[PDB]
Design a protein around this ligand. Structure first.
Ligand SMILES: *Cc1cc2c(nc3c(=O)[nH]c(=O)nc-3n2C[C@H](O)[C@H](O)[C@H](O)COP(=O)(O)OP(=O)(O)OC[C@H]2O[C@@H](n3cnc4c(N)ncnc43)[C@H](O)[C@@H]2O)c(*)c1C
Ligand SMILES: *[C@@H]1O[C@H](CO)[C@@H](O)[C@H](O)[C@H]1NC(C)=O
Length: 463
């Protein structure tokens, strides 16, 4: 019996090659690897997930869940041709428990709508990223750094429990008591490898007070070293109430953007040392806001925008290769900064973002060895993105960004951030000291490797 027949028993919506439903379901944030799945199935009940997992084993196809579809390597179209993609769009369950300070979120939510739901419900938030079309599933399972993360942690740190359909079909619950091994794996290594997460229970945070957004911006190739050195020096002493990220690109633009959890009249002592050592005359924008306004400002919408915009942020696409790396304190040497900026300037149509971690952050204050997310001792992470609109530049842009990564590697660590997934990173760089434990758990919960992709947790230990 075929795949069409098996999935019709479950009753979920499907889409199969050659149809227009299948063509529009192929949308992905990165359009570089236009992987062609066997079929798309759109579950709305747990049993329909169980059907898809059963049906893929019976027909002998691969299967991956898809949330928001932002995977930088297209792993949510499978990472190869001929996979059953289980698009979790129908899991939008929501509920907020004010007393427990917890929220139940379905694995098909997007960051935009989730922010709105959580604000309307009780003026609370999870510390997620700033791209509103990003699905909570991939984001939370791989880490998740946002502009409140230095106070409240990573999204992954605020997972209290998950429920997933396992490879053998059982509906499983993982939390600090039930199934600790699986609960450990999914906070950091949860993408695809251990099954299909259907819902999260998040620890949520009060953001009813006013916050302050700030951004200092330049457009001058000559001040890049100075502005970046001042960011590093400043970065080492930022208290947890600020989360900030630095931006740089080959056209000469540089900026510092951040969010202070506090009143705007308290801000200047906290950003004074950055401005003093940065170049003069920064484009200065400081604004006091409530939380939903901040989410909008952080995605280039003016603060007067209707909050309901978050339910309908347009899904945009790119075609790019992306790499990441971590940098430990006190940062890159002065030679490393020059080497980095020079490498960057040999190219164009690329951008580089530096999310601040640091020793004051909730992120680095976790006890090591209690999650699959291991990057608890860096100053910041570097996101490296090189884009193209014409396929003739794909080789030059991919070599450009890979050279850049090698230049910086001399001056930094060999770890990288798994939400900026990169097919050319060894798994040791994502999981390090916790990889053995992840592989043991992979053997236990999926011995047949039903759930795999080019960077899924393997079944074979390193000797
Ligand atoms: C496109 C995009 C990505 C961003 C942006 N900004 C970020 C930010 O401000 N902070 C960050 O920490 N990260 C940012 N990123 C990167 C994202 O964090 C990652 O791209 C996320 O991993 C994306 O998650 P998602 O939208 O769900 O993408 P998918 O491609 O659907 O899935 C990724 C990965 O996870 C597996 N998976 C998905 N769904 C499940 C479920 N339900 N259960 C188990 N496993 C799941 C997929 O199979 C795949 O492997 C800004 C922008 C614009
Ligand atoms: C699936 O595996 C889990 C853990 O190994 C087990 O508890 C459950 O009973 C299994 N279900 C089956 C084999 O149907």
């Amino acid at each position: 019996t075929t795949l069409k027949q098996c999935l019709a028993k479950g009753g979920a919506r499907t889409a199969f090659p050659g149809t227009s439903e299948y063509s529009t379901a192929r949308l992905a944030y990165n359009l570089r690897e236009r992987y062609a799945p066997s079929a798309f199935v759109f579950p709305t009940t747990v049993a329909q997930v169980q059907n898809a997992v059963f049906c893929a084993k019976q027909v002998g196809v691969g299967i991956v869940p898809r949330g928001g579809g932002h995977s930088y390597e297209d792993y949510s179209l499978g990472g190869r041709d001929g996979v059953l993609v289980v698009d979790m769009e129908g899991f939008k369950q929501f509920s907020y428990n004010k007393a427990a300070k917890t929220a139940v979120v379905g694995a098909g939510f997007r960051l935009g709508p989730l922010y709105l739901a959580l604000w309307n419900a009780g003026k609370v938030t999870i510390p997620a990223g700033n791209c509103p079309t990003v699905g909570i599933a991939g984001h939370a399972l791989g880490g998740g750094w946002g502009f409140s993360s230095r106070k409240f942690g990573l999204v992954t740190d605020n997972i209290l429990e998950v429920q997933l359909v396992a490879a053998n079909g059982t509906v499983v619950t993982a939390n600090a008591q039930k199934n600790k091994d699986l609960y450990f794996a999914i906070r950091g290594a949860g993408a695809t490898s251990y099954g299909i997460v259907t819902q999260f229970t998040f620890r949520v945070h009060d953001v009813s007070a006013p916050v302050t957004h700030f951004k200092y911006r330049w457009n001058d190739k000559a001040v890049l070293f100075k502005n970046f050195k001042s960011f590093q020096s400043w970065g080492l002493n930022v208290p947890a109430e600020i989360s900030a990220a630095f931006y740089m690109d080959p056209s000469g633009v540089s900026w510092l953007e951040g969010t202070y959890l506090g009143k705007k009249t308290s801000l200047l002592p906290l950003v004074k040392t950055f401005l003093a050592s940065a170049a003069p005359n920064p484009t200065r924008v400081e604004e006091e806001l409530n939380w939903i306004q901040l989410i909008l400002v952080n995605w280039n919408y003016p603060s007067n925008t209707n909050p309901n915009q978050l339910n309908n942020v347009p899904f945009t696409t790119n075609t790019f290769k992306a790499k990441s790396i971590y940098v430990n304190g006190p940062g890159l040497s002065d030679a490393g900064i020059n080497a980095m900026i020079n490498a960057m300037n040999t190219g164009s149509n690329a951008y580089f973002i530096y999310d601040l971690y640091g020793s004051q952050s909730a992120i680095n204050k976790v006890v090591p060895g209690e999650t699959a997310f291991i990057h608890r001792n860096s100053l910041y992470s570097i996101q490296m993105v090189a884009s193209w609109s014409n396929d003739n530049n794909a080789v030059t842009q991919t070599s450009y960004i890979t050279r850049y990564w090698k230049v910086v590697r001399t001056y930094a660590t060999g770890q990288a951030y798994q939400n900026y997934i990169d097919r050319d990173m060894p798994l040791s760089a994502y999981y390090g000291s916790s990889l053995s434990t992840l592989i043991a758990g992979k053997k236990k919960w999926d011995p047949q490797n039903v759930f795999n992709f080019p960077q899924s947790i393997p079944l074979k230990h390193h000797h």
